[PDB]
């Protein structure tokens, strides 16, 4: 009993390599009964009933010998390196198993056609995340007790077999992420009336969801993402009394959201993004359990209904790239833990809801390419959770809230192409995580504050087309990660600093159309990744440094300055000419004579 089982366990272990020594309890000082060995569970008569070797890093062929344990009912080899292929014989003796978990291993080759006959008592079968190939055997329809089947993430091909509809005990059917031929969802899956989980994402499915699936009245999670299903989202999903998740992202669904979607009180997550839906968001929403609503990249029209505010656990709202209109519900966010809000590329208007970050969890506020107007609320100035703000291409105006500039987790601050006014405050010093500052095409004024040069991670400062004045702060020149500096079309004055070697990552320097003066520093030419240099329309004077000829410039523009001497010889050709026009004192040396 303990004798027999210890020996069979040890036999099984001998056919495996165990480089992490996960099974050291099995062969160390024989004495401890096997019942207390790692991964081993016994019944009251001390017979092994369950072997669970999950995540033990074991290598080698399937350990068929474990099946010789007379009371073994559960075997898990989840997340190891069991390798080679499965044979008919591997499972000859495994007929007492109820639970078999071979997920996340290295198995290759076909599923044996004999598997159901050798494992007739199985309730749970998982072989997800391997490299299995060939078709799912039609023999699978012979299982009399199977409750859950997971073959997701293999290379299974052919088409999903119709005989699976015979397995009427199934509650979970997971086939996602295989290499099936393009085909419809088999009609016969409608016969699996107990199903709670149907996961056929990335299955090369075409055609409509079959009308027979309306018989799946117990569905909790329907996930058909990543296919080319067509026609309408059927209205019977709305009558599911226990539905929690509907995932239909990246299909070819057309028509409209069923009107009665509003009464799906149990729904937690709804995604129908990346389809061809038209019509409006259903109104009279009573989505009391909703956590996530994604409907981006469709052709939805009309407003976000006020009733979305009844969803007091809503955290994710992604509606971008539709034709949505009107003002947002003024209370949006006041009573929801909003974390990710992306309403970009629509036609929304009116003010940004003032309590969008009311519960202090908002991380992404993405509103690009709408017609939002008025001011950013001072409330937003205190939203310390914000990491990514994109408010560009709206009709916003006024001063930015003071603390907005120094929020401690803010990474991307994009405000471009609005009508914002004011100076950038010195409290920007607080924005320790700032990577990208994108503020071009506004009416900001004053001097660029010195403290921007303390923000060591900054990779982009983009501030073109404003009213900035004063000097370029010496501090910018020691931002070691700065990639893009664009301050074109302002009223900046003074000089460029001489010592620029701190700009080891600068790719673009654009300072065109300001009132800058002095000489172009020699060290511009020693910058190792500069490919864009625009200093046009300023008052730079003196000679063009010969070191510029080290650079490979996509853009070089020195036009409309007060430069003197000769053009560097590398640029003497007539094709480069427009790069230097409008410098009265400058000439080009060609054929033994200097020419304007
Ligand atoms: C698969 O198994 C390995 C252990 O063999 C797991 O890797 C360990 O996971 C924890 C993280 O929770 C780390 O502290 C260990 O350092 C990891 N070890 C190694 C070798 O990487 C891995 O988490 C398991 N995978 C799953 C999905 O559970
Ligand atoms: C299972 O298939 C995968 C995915 O094709 C193989 O994983 C690697 O695939 C990448 C590129 O697709 C290659 O650079 C490697 O050669 C593959 N990994 C290796 C050789 O370890 C994977 O090899 C397959 N596994 C088995 C056991 O055949
Ligand atoms: C170099 O920069 C100057 C501006 O400093 C460019 O000239 C402007 O070009 C636009 C056309 O897109 C006109 O609207 C402006 O009126 C021009 N400014 C002046 C002062 O004439 C010029 O095109 C750039 N040259 C190259 C080769 O890129
Ligand atoms: C199983 O993996 C080991 C070690 O990585 C290898 O030496 C052995 O030949 C593998 N077996 C098969 C059939 O690939
Ligand atoms: C199994 O399913 C096939 C295909 O739907 C069907 O024709 C066959 O009669 C079914 N057999 C059993 C035993 O249910
Ligand atoms: C959309 O799904 C298809 C499979 O139908 C996939 O090949 C494609 O890359 C996916 N695209 C996106 C953006 O998810
Ligand atoms: Mg910008």
Numbering used by the authors: 20 to 615
Reproduce the article's own wording on this structure:
The LRR-RKs HAESA (greek: to adhere to) and HAESA-LIKE 2 (HSL2) redundantly control floral abscission. A receptor protein called HAESA is found on the surface of the cells that surround a future break point on the plant. The peptide hormone IDA binds to the HAESA LRR ectodomain.
We purified the HAESA ectodomain (residues 20–620) from baculovirus-infected insect cells and quantified the interaction of the ~75 kDa glycoprotein with synthetic IDA peptides using isothermal titration calorimetry (ITC). We next determined crystal structures of the apo HAESA ectodomain and of a HAESA-IDA complex, at 1.74 and 1.86 Å resolution, respectively.
